């Protein structure tokens, strides 16, 4: 019944498409359906406001620039409300604080909309602004999106529906892999860690807000009557207050946590694939897979287990680390370690996308807390960290207090969902950083002070060191349009630490894999890396989540990887043909 | 020093224009003054909206039409102050709620959260919450009548419309370049001319000014030229409580000082009204109403209204002129005298009911609807007055202060300012007389009730004596002009009702122009309309009907003669700016 739904500037475009969508509407609501509808201003007539605002000054003042701005919805939903009342369908334009009001940010809808609920069709643009004062103003870029989910959450609508010109989420980019398949569901969570399967057709923080208040959503086409895709959340109730630029959503502590790791072993491909496929023959589910970058010929693999199946998985660690040697003899090679007494800790939310000083934020209130990080893994929404487990309640609490948040469970359908690839990265490590506390805080603090954002960050074990005192080396990646600056803001800060050093590899490609039923699965992670081996792929770094893999790889092979990924898994799906006589 | 501005759309089409009234603005506030900005929509941005919403419907819901068309005035005073700061000119931009409420007659009414902004700001205005609409406008002349009743409620020094025009002109340049451009001008006169201000200022404001003594002034942006002041009277300690923006009619008026002389059938020919006020002038007698309805055969009569002291000079003087109309002397059936002391001259006045339809026919019905009967009618721009039996006065009046919710306005003063101010012409009407319309309440009613009903609105109504017929139910004919368009459509809805009025009939006359002189100067000054008449005899131009207010004189003449009869207005009264002799090059 109660549907709330969007419709983007191109879906607005022209009049004719106006009465389209009017169409469309009518015939929803003749579903036996109520409407609240949302819509973008028309088209490039925001970029046409903007252009002409910068000929009258480089810097504009902000609210004359809201206002501004705020005209577009003004008219389109105003256009949309006519075009349904031509074709006799009761419609009303509602306008800034008779939807809501935004304080600065934290927005909050009402309902005289509840009211005009009765015959009519809602249609809503602006809020009511406070600081000066503005009677009408937008919520920015993605506003849109995040309107429409917080309505239908203060409404208590049955689901909400984002219109565009996509017929919803693919399993990858089209453009790489033709065989690309159309999703008809996705989780918020999935949909958070392939963010960028969603780039221009919906907003992080809306996904992550329908997730946390229990909104069905579906991405459709406004020019097809198909399904689009449903992007589905668990189900969760009255809740008015709405922080709409956190950068984190939530802080995560795991205490059932054991390390195992395998040493020095050969850095070609093949090697994470035998490793994880014989511990998944053990039908052993593994949560972390940390790999940072090669130390010589060689490198190190970490993974973590809950602390019961530590003891299983190291025997079996044990027994494979032999067929791993380069030569039988080699008993430098594939040594194997184990820790018992960590836990993982992570912040999580989609905020932090694109946006910098988050993950050194993070890392400045472990230092100060004084707790030392062991290893480090990002996914795209998270940044976990492993610690010594006796600081894990210190910790957590710093974490909570320092973000705002409260805790989400330790821990919560196919394998994988989707992959994709970024190949507009560029890889930097900096060799033998001090384990001790607070020294990723200040290489971190210090590229975020320079507005770089940073995409990845990856650390794994201890430096082989011939002597000097323990350290880690730390690997992360930026775009290559930061490379340059990056290292030249961080060869400074460990001028004087021993043997540190500061390596730059630009070609590289991240290959990802994402899918809610990987946890409790034992053998994704083997699969994944299996399909790449098979293709003579090496695979540089490893960083996870619960539900992302992601693998560096040689840029050259990015594309290649990509397509491995998708058939190991079988993106494409499964088509069927007339078998003859 | 609290100066409110406003600047039109083309003096903000481009943004190279928006650039360069920030600029004057910024000169203006250094001058030593505070300032409130309205500024409209962009250009032909609004006409490019409406565009739009005619695309999907020819029928817009109109609170759907306010909020359309209130974005481009928000886009405007967001551009416009964003220039001010970029000059570091301190400015904000106001808007809905914060500026002031209209209800809905229409309720319009300000507050001061910018008396407050007003400390170092220039406040730049759009919109007004609507009682729900968070924010929209007041409609077409909206800008106009927003700035006005925003200087009335902040008692501004002054008001200053901007736009891309030096100010009024005496006449239309296009017919007569030596159109002098006005220094001054009085509200009234302005509303009496409102064609002379057609595309730059809304008659509803210049009327709004007047009422609350707001010094006005036309300027262009373009330019530092003084521009035309529009002058009210000092109106001192009345509060802008809070406004009706959409009233057709501002007020009601009485006067019992009159008295009827009518010279019947007389020759309908050029030169006769000219020797009738020229004489009756020579007397230094001054008159008030002159009407003159459509002819009779080939005669017509001519009736004015005097003073009730001076009817007996005027009825001796008009007497004496008369056998000099005539075939000879002592001819008969030829120009005589009559004369009715009974009388008064009520009226509905306001500036909202030009190009409105069912004012004067609203007018009509109330009258009748009290049982007092029409006896003559004439129309100005911005009045109807009909002339009453003395007697029915007070129920009369009572009557119509009701229907239009207004109160009797008080007789005004005296004066002398210059007979008349600037001249006009109009050749887009038609005439169309409805031939013996029976002498009883209602029938002019139920005539005009039908052309509103039809949206047909009426520009000119004139009615004069009693038809002359042997025996029957007396009766008079009713001339009224509209647009040629409306011509027909008007026809065919009367020609129903007269069907069983005897010897009734309707008659169109396309072929006309109407010429109107105007000036407040001409109110109490014998021999003005003495002086227009002679005007149009001396380019052997007939009049076919004239009409008349306290201030304006109109005279309706053939088409083929509507500009020559212009000029000769506007040589008449010297309004290009001396005399001239045209001589040999
Ligand atoms: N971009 C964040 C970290 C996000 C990591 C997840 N991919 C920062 O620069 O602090
Ligand atoms: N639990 C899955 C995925 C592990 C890697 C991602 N957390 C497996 O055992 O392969
Ligand atoms: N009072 C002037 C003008 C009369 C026509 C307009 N009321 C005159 O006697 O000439
Ligand atoms: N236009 C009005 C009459 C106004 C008087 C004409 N100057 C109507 O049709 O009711
Ligand atoms: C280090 C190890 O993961 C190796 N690069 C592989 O591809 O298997
Ligand atoms: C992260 C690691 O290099 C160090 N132990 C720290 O806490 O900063
Ligand atoms: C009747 C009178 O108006 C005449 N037609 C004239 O022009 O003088
Ligand atoms: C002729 C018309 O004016 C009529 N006397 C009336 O009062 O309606």
């Not at 000066?132 to 203060?154: K, M, N, P, Q, Y």
Request: negative net charge; contains cysteine.
């Amino acid at each position: 019944a109660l549907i709330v739904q969007k419709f983007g500037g191109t879906s607005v475009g022209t009049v004719e498409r106006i009465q389209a969508v009017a169409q469309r509407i009518k015939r929803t609501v003749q579903g036996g359906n109520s409407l609240v509808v949302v819509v973008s201003a028309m088209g490039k007539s925001t970029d046409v406001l903007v252009d002409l605002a910068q000929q009258i000054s480089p810097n504009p003042c902000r609210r004359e620039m809201d206002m501004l701005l705020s005209t577009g919805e003004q008219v389109s939903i105003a256009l949309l409300s006519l075009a349904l009342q031509e074709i006799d369908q009761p419609a009303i334009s509602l306008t800034g604080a008779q939807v809501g009001i935004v304080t600065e940010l934290e927005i909050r809808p009402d309902r005289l909309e509840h009211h005009l609920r009765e015959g009519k069709v809602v249609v809503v643009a602006g809020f009511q602004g406070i600081s000066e004062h503005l009677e009408i103003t937008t919520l920015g870029r993605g506003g849109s999106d995040t309107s429409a989910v917080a309505l239908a959450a203060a409404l208590k609508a049955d689901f909400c529906e984002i219109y565009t010109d996509v017929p919803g989420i693919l399993t990858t980019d089209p453009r790489l892999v033709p065989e690309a398949q159309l999703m008809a569901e996705i989780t918020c969570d999935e949909m958070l860690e392939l963010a960028s399967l969603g780039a221009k057709v919906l907003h992080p923080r809306a996904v992550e807000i329908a997730r946390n208040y229990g909104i069905p959503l579906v991405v459709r086409s406004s020019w097809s009557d198909e399904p689009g895709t449903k992007v589905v959340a668990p189900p969760v109730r009255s809740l008015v207050g709405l922080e709409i630029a956190k950068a984190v959503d939530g802080v995560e502590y795991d205490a059932d946590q054991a390390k195992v790791a395998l040493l020095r072993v050969p850095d070609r491909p093949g090697v994470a694939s035998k490793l994880f496929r014989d511990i998944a023959q053990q039908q052993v589910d593994i949560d972390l897979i940390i790999q940072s970058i090669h130390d010589g010929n060689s490198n190190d693999i970490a993974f973590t287990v809950v602390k019961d199946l530590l003891n299983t998985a190291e025997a079996v660690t044990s027994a494979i680390a032999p067929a791993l040697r380069s030569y039988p003899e080699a008993d430098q090679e594939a040594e194997i370690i184990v820790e018992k007494g960590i836990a993982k800790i992570a912040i999580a939310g989609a905020g932090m996308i694109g946006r910098p000083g988050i993950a050194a934020k993070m890392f400045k209130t472990l230092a100060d807390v004084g707790v030392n990080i062991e290893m480090i893994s990002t996914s795209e929404v998270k940044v976990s960290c492993v610690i010594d487990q006796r600081d894990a309640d210190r910790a957590i609490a710093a974490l909570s207090n320092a973000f705002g948040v409260t805790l989400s469970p330790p821990k919560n359908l196919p394998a994988v969902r989707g992959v994709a690839l970024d190949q507009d990265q560029a890889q930097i490590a900096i060799r033998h950083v001090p384990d001790r506390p607070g020294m990723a805080a200040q290489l971190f603090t210090a590229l975020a002070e320079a507005n770089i954002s940073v995409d990845m960050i990856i650390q794994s074990q201890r430096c082989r060191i011939n002597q000097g005192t323990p350290c880690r080396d730390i690997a992360f990646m930026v775009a290559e349009g930061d490379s340059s600056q990056a290292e030249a803001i961080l060869q400074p800060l460990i001028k004087d630490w021993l043997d540190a050093a500061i390596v730059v590899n630009k070609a590289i490609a991240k290959v990802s894999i994402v899918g809610s039923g990987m946890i409790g699965h034992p053998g994704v992670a083997a699969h994944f890396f299996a399909a790449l081996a098979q293709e003579n792929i090496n695979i540089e770094m490893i960083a996870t989540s619960e539900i992302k893999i992601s693998c560096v790889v040689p840029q050259d092979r990015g594309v290649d990887a990509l397509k491995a990924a998708h058939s190991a898994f079988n993106l494409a799906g499964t088509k069927t043909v007339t078998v003859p006589a």
